Every structure is written in C-alpha cells, then in structure tokens.
Amino acid sequence: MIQQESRLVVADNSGAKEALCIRVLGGTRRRYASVGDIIVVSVKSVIPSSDIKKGAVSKAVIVRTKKEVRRPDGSYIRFDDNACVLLNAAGDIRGSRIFGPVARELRGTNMKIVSLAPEVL
RNA sequence: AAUACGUGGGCCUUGUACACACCGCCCGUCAAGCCAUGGGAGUCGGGGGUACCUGAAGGGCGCG
Numbered sequence: 520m521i522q523q524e525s526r527l528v529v530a531d532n533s534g535a536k537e538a539l540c541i542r543v544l545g546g547t548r549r550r551y552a553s554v555g556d557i558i559v560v561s562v563k564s565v566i567p568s569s570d571i572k573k574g575a576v577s578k579a580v581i582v583r584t585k586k587e588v589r590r591p592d593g594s595y596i597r598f599d600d601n602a603c604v605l606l607n608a609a610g611d612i613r614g615s616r617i618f619g620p621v622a623r624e625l626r627g628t629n630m631k632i633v634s635l636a637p638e639v640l
Numbered sequence: 641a642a643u644a645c646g647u648g649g650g651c652c653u654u655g656u657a658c659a660c661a662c663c664g665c666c667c668g669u670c671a672a673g674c675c676a677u678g679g680g681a682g683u684c685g686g687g688g689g690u691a692c693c694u695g696a697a698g699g700g701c702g703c704g
Contacts, residue, residue, distance in 0.1 A: 567685065 520586040521552045530582055530602040532616035534569020535562045554588055555628035556581050579603040580630055582621040
C-alpha cells in the first residue's frame, strides 16, 4: 500500500538510496500500489559518486511492501520495509544487484530479471 | 628727408630621471585585447578524528 508522497528504500546497486513516490500508474484515482506495480519516483538521496542524480524523476517497480499481500492459495506475505527497484525508459533494471528479498509475485509481472534477488519469497 | 641710442647670439658657474638630446622623457584614470589570481548566497566531493549503536574469523574468558 504505497501512495503519493510515500518514501521507499531503493533495493538495487544503482546510486539511489531513498525515493519518493510521485504517482501510481494505472488509471484515474488509482490510490495504492503493491508488489510488482510500476510507480514514478523522485530520487531523494544518493551515495557519493552515484550514476543517478538527486532529484531525477524515474520509474520504479515495487518489490517489498510493509502491508501484507494475499496469494490465491490462502497465504500472506509482509515485509519490514517498503522497497522499489529503479527502471530505465525501456523498462529494464538500471542496476546490476538486488539487495534483500523480493516478493514471489514479481515472477509474473514480466519482471524476470529481478531473479538477481538473493531469495524470492 | 625724419629720427633714439637705452632697453635673439657667446663665455663662466650650477641642476638634470634628456643622449633621436625639451619639437626630450614621462606618470595616472576611462575605453580595447590576451593571461594569471582574489571575495561570494550556496552547492558537490575526498579521505582522516571523536562519540554512539551493530558486528565476521580466530584466539582468550565463564552450548555464552
């Protein structure tokens, strides 16, 4: 459950550390985004000598949600943070590593290259 | 014919920042062209220090 002005951890090896959600894409008055949803972000903090600049508007895919997500088999998963991965214009990973676990729902989001993740839960 | 003869050159000394020689040299501002370098709301880095919190391996100390 991520909305406009929510702050997310950036869970890849690109320069960004924190991001701010500008917009949830997908329709008029679409309020919330969950794992596997695409959002627009503004980069809030970077590491020194970062490829991406502070204040850069970018796209991202949500990979971890504090609010729990329901699976059709009656199971639920929730994480301790809210984390996203930045994307380029083509819709591909901007970086090369993924830090922390990612949700299993990302397999079906045509986002298979996040198989860089240490563990898919 | 008239009319009074007293008010630019040479010699000696002196100063010189001139020696094409005072029709000389020469300062400073404004304007023009290149070069280097100061101040500045801020903003971006680099490694070191202090304190705190976490904390591997391997010894020590009493499965911690």
